[PDB]
C-alpha cells in the first residue's frame with residue numbers, strides 16, 4: 095500500500111483521503127487535512143520544527159530543513175538572486191526556452207509527446223538560467239540532475255550523477271566568485287561575500303535544482319490536460335496577462351501537485367479544538383485536501399480559471415513559503431499561453447488512450463501525454 | 468600490502484605524450500595489408516529539415532576543439548610514437564549529391580577508407596545531400612581514438628555545438644576537466660610502478676601470469692577455412708533470440724547463488740564450446756566500458772573500453788550450476804585486477820604475437836541491458852554495415868525488460884570472422900547457444916555431456 099495522503103483519483107484527492115477529517119492520527123503521526131489547521135501548522139514557526147551538529151551535508155542549503163534563526167539568515171542571503179528586477183530579466187530567456195521546445199514539438203510533427211518534449215524540459219532549463227549555468231552546458235547539466243533522481247537507475251549511477259553535477263557547480267562557483275558575474279551566484283557574493291560560505295552556495299544551487307523541476311513539470315502536464323478536458327476555460331489563457339495569471343493561480347490550487355510539505359514536529363503540546371498534538375509527535379499536511387476545503391472556497395471541486403484567487407496553500411504558507419513562487423507563476427504563464435499561440439487547436443492525440451499519471455515522485459504529474467493540433 | 472594508484476588529474480602537458488597500451492596496439496596493428504579493414508566505428512544520421520550546413524561544419528570543428536584526442540595524430544616509429552595534439556582539426560563539409568539507391572554504397576566506401584595515423588586525424592566526416600531538406604551525415608572514427616560509448620558523447624557534443632553555431636554564437640561551455648592525454652599519462656605512471664616490488668601493478672601482473680599460465684594459443688572452433696597469415700577482418704552476422712519464458716526461468720537461478728545474467732550466459736556458452744570440441748580449458752573474453760566510478764571520464768571521448776578475459780575450467784562433466792559457480796568465482800577474483808591493460812598481457816605471458824589471431828581469447832561475449840536531437844531537424848540513425856572484427860566469434864546479446872522491469876526475452880546477434888566461418892556454421896552455433904540456454908533454464912542441473920545440440924532442419 096502507498097500512503098493515503100499521496101493518493102489521487104484523476105485530478106481529485108482519492109476517496110479514502112476525502113474521508114479523513116480535519117485532523118486525525120494515522121500510521122503517532124497526525125494528518126492535517128483542513129485548510130485552517132494546515133495554515134496554522136505551517137504558519138506557527140515557534141511550535142513546529144521542520145528539521146529531522148545536526149545537519150548532514152546533503153541537507154545543507156536545503157532551507158526546508160532549517161528552523162529560524164538559521165533559516166532566516168540563509169533565506170535572506172539568497173535575496174539578491176530573486177528580485178522582481180531579476181525575474182523580469184529572466185522573462186525573455188524563459189520565452190526563448192519555451193519557443194525552442196515548441197519548435198521541437200512541431201519538428202517531431204503531430205502527434206508529439208508534450209511531457210517528454212515540453213513539460214520535462216522547460217522547468218529544468220529555466221532553473222539553469224536562474225542560477226547561471228553556461229548556455230550550452232544546460233542540456234548536459236540537466237541530464238545529470240535528472241539521472242541523479244531517476245529511480246530506475248541503480249543507486250550507484252545515481253550517486254555518481256549527483257556528484258558530477260555538484261562538481262560542476264563547485265567548478266562554476268570558483269569562476270563566478272573569482273571575479274563575479276551578475277547572475278545568481280554573482281549578485282549574492284557581491285552583496286554577502288564573506289558571510290555565505292562556499293558550502294552554503296554549493297548546497298543552495300543543488301536544492302534549487304531539486305525543488306523547482308518536478309513541481310513545475312507536473313503543473314505543465316496536468317494543466318494542459320485539465321484545460322483540454324474543459325476547453326471553455328482555455329480562453330482565459332488567450333487574453334492578457336492579468337487573465338493568464340488568474341487562470342494559472344486557479345490551476346495551481348485546483349491541481350495542487352505537491353502531496354505534502356516537509357513533515358512538522360511539535361516543539362511543544364499544541365492544542366487544536368479538542369485534540370492535542372503532543373510535543374514530539376509529527377504532523378503531515380495534505381495540501382490537496384486543504385485546497386479542496388469548503389472553508390477556503392465554494393465549488394472547490396470545480397475548475398474555474400476565471401474565479402478570484404484564494405489563499406490556497408499549494409505554495410505552502412509562512413516562513414518556508416515557496417521561494418520559487420514568482421518564477422513559477424511567470425514560467426507557467428509564458429508556457430501555457432505560448433503553447434496555445436503556437437497550437438490554437440491543441441488536443442489529445444488519442445482521446446481513448448489511458449491517462450498516464452506520475453505517482454512515484456513528490457509531485458503529481460503525467461509521465462506522458464500525446465497531443466495533436 | 469600493495470600500494471595504490473596515482474591520482475587521475477589534469478597534468479601539465481609534456482612534449483612527448485605517451486600512447487595508452489590500447490592505442491599502441493591499435494597503432495602497431497595498423498594496415499597489415501591494404502586489403503584489410505579498417506578498425507573503425509561508423510555512425511550515420513539521417514537529417515530531415517532545414518540544415519544549416521555552415522553551422523554543422525563549425526560544430527564538427529567544435530567537437531574536436533572540446534576533445535584533444537580528435538585533433539591528435541600519432542607520428543613516429545614503433546619506438547617513438549607519441550600523441551601529437553594539434554590546436555584544431557580541419558573540417559571541410561562540402562555536400563556530396565546522392566540518391567537513396569547509391570547512398571549505401573557511398574556510406575560503405577567512406578567508412579572503409581583507411582587512416583594513416585601518423586599524418587591523419589583519427590576521424591572523418593561526410594555530408595550526403597539527398598534533397599533540399601534531406602541529408603545524411605556520416606561519421607567514422609578510428610578505434611585508436613574511440614570506444615563505442617564515445618560515439619554517443621560525440622553526438623551529444625555535436626548537438627550542443629550545432630545549437631549554438633546555428634544561432635550565431637560559438638558554444639558556451641565549461642572545458643573538460645580531463646583530456647585523454649591526462650588519462651594516458653596516468654596509465655603510464657601506474658605502469659611505472661613495476662619499479663617498486665610492492666606496487667599495485669606488480670600485484671596485478673602476478674595475478675594474470677598465474678590465472679592465464681599455460682593457455683593454448685587458440686580456441687578449437689568449427690572452422691570452414693584455415694587461418695590466413697594476414698586477416699581481412701571481414702564479418703558476417705546471424706540474429707538470435709531466447710524467448711521470454713526461458714529468459715525468466717534462467718533469472719530464477721540467478722538469485723539462487725549470486726550470479727547475474729551475463730555470467731549465466733557465459734557459463735552456458737562455455738559448456739557449448741566444450742561440447743563443440745574446444746576442450747575443458749577455455750578463455751571467454753568480454754569488453755567492459757570505462758570504470759563508471761571515474762567521474763571525470765564520463766563526458767570524454769577515448770579508447771576507454773577494456774578487454775577482460777576469464778579463464779574457465781570445465782573438467783569433470785560439471786552441472787550448469789557448477790559451471791556458473793566456477794565462472795562467478797573466477798570473475799569476482801579477476802574483477803579486482805583491471806588496472807593492467809589487457810594489451811599488456813600478451814607480453815607478460817611471453818606469448819608469440821600473431822597478426823592472424825586475437826591473443827588470449829578468440830571468443831567474445833557481450834550481454835547488455837536495454838537502452839540525438841538537433842534544432843529544426845528530425846534525426847534518426849541511418850543503418851550502416853557491420854564493423855571489422857578481430858575476434859573469431861563475438862556474441863552481442865541484449866536483455867529486454869517489460870514495464871515491471873521483468874525479463875522479456877534475450878535478443879541479439881553473433882558476429883563472426885568470415886575468413887574462418889560460413890554463415891551456416893555461425894547459424895548452427897547461434898541456434899545451439901539458444902538451445903543450450905533453454906535446456907539449462909528448465910534443468911539447471913544438467914551436465915555438459917547431457918546437452919542436446921541436435922538441430923532440426
Ligand code: HEM
Pocket residue numbers: 136156157158159169221224301302305306307309310311313351352354355356357407408409410411413414415416417418419421422
Ligand atoms: C511549480 C510549482 C511549485 C510548487 C507547487 C512548490 C511547492 C512548494 C511548497 C509547498 C513549499 C513549502 C514546503 C514546506 O513548507 O514544507 C515550497 C518551498 C520551497 N520551494 Fe517550491 N514549489 C514549486 C516550484 C518551485 C521552484 C520553481 C523553485 C525554485 C526555483 C522552488 C524552490 C523552493 C525552495 C528553495 C523552498 C524552501 C523555502 C524555505 O524553506 O524557506 N519551488 N515549494
